[PDB]
């Protein structure tokens, strides 16, 4: 039996999202055609995991974004962007986007992606909240209510 | 701006899920370039929704399943085994095993797929609720627990 990592889900065509993967998730993960990983945490990759990371033709992109509770938060627009930069590179797919619980951090990048994809904030924030389950932040959504685009 | 249908989500490559499509979503539906769609409600497709179907060359397979509440649920193994067949024919992808809300019925088959795909009742169940929410039901999941994967 295969075990998708926590809060696992398929973002767009060739993109994946999940809370935070581990050993029990390797088999399943070792099938998505993972060419790279988008890890949104300012902590080192767990050895057991990292072993898999390397010996799999999987590149790691770690845009460390400090994670603080809702009482008082703050999302790194820049870091997310550097991630939204890589994520948008077709050559990088298939990629798995992930942080800790895969709800907030992984929420902005995917949420923003959707924005650039021309979704309505309404249907957008819905997808955002569909995952957050227990805890679901408002600040992270507003951060997106105002995500300006270059192009 | 684009508006995905109710509880839209990309199940896997080619496969999608959601609730009863509303005109306010079509623009988005064209994005998917759907080839086929699996229907689970017995009521006949409306006027608009059907116009789009033809106006967009999308094949519709219907497998009307009754819609009851938690107290007395009951899914037709037959009408599920079949739709699961349609879903398994690459020729059909794109798809959308949608029903009226995209919570139970949709999730049932979308779950049974995961069963075939050699997932895990639990990792399968957590996905199921990620669409039913405060309206999740044991009945359905039980169906899944039972459903045989001996093709």
Structure description:
Chains A, B: Residues 63-75 are annotated as: WPD loop important for active site topology. Chains A, B: It comes from Arabidopsis thaliana. Chains A, B: This is Inositol diphosphatase DSP1. Chains A, B: It is an enzyme of class 3 (hydrolase). The structure is a homodimer of 151-residue chains. With 151 residues, chain A is an alpha/beta fold. Chain A has one domain: Protein-Tyrosine Phosphatase, Chain A (Alpha-Beta Complex), CATH 3.90.190.10. Helix content of chain A is 38%, strand content 12%. Chain A is built from six helices and five strands; from the N terminus they run E-E-H-E-H-E-H-E-H-H-H. Chain A has helices at residues 23-29, 47-54, 77-87, 105-116, 121-132, 139-145, and strands at residues 9-10, 15-18, 36-39, 59-62, 95-98. In chain A, strands 1-2-5-3-4 form a five-stranded mixed β-sheet, covered by helices on one side. In chain A, helix 3 (77-87) packs across helix 4, helix 4 (105-116) runs antiparallel to helix 5 and helix 4 (105-116) packs parallel to helix 6 (139-145). The first copy, chain A, is globular. Chains A and B meet through strand 1 and helix 5 of A and strand 1 and helix 5 of B.
Looking at this protein, list some descriptive labels:
151 residues; 6 helices; homodimer; five-stranded mixed β-sheet
Sheet with the most strands: spatial strand order of chain A: 1-2-5-3-4
* Total domains of chain A: 1
Strand content of chain A: 5-15%
Radius of gyration of chain A: 15 Å
Outline type of chain A:
globular
**Which chains make the largest contact?**
A-B, 21 and 20 residues
* Secondary-structure element pattern of chain A, one letter each: EEHEHEHEHHH
- Helical fraction of chain A equals 25-40%
**How far is the N terminus from the C terminus of chain A?**
44 Å
DSSP strand tally of chain A: 5
**Based on helices, strands and strand pairing, what is the structural class of chain A?**
alpha/beta
Helical region count of chain A?
Answer: 6
Oligomer: homodimer
Kindly identify the CATH topology of chain A: Protein-Tyrosine Phosphatase, Chain A
Largest sheet of chain A: 5 strands, mixed
CATH-assigned homologous superfamily of chain A? Protein tyrosine phosphatase superfamily
Q: Based on the structure given, which CATH architecture of chain A is correct?
A: Alpha-Beta Complex
- The CATH class of chain A is Alpha Beta
Keywords (chains A, B): Hydrolase
Protein name (chains A, B): Inositol diphosphatase DSP1
Site (Transition state stabilizer) (chains A, B): 105
Organism (chains A, B): Arabidopsis thaliana (Mouse-ear cress)
């Amino acid at each position: 039996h295969l075990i998708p990592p926590l809060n696992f889900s398929m973002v767009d065509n060739g993109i994946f999202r999940s809370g935070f993967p581990d050993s029990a998730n390797f088999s399943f993960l070792q099938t998505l055609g993972l060419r790279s990983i988008i890890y949104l945490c300012p902590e080192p990759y767990p050895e057991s995991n990292l072993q898999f990371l390397k010996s799999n033709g999987i590149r790691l992109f770690q845009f460390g974004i400090e994670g603080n509770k809702e009482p008082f938060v703050n999302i790194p627009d820049h870091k997310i962007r550097m991630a939204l930069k890589v994520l948008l590179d077709e050559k990088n797919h298939p990629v798995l986007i992930h942080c800790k619980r895969g709800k907030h951090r992984t929420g902005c990048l995917v949420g923003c992606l959707r924005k650039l994809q021309k979704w309505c904030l309404t249907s957008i924030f819905d997808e955002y909240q569909r995952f957050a389950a227990a805890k679901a932040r408002v600040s992270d959504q507003r951060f997106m209510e105002i995500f300006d685009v270059s192009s």
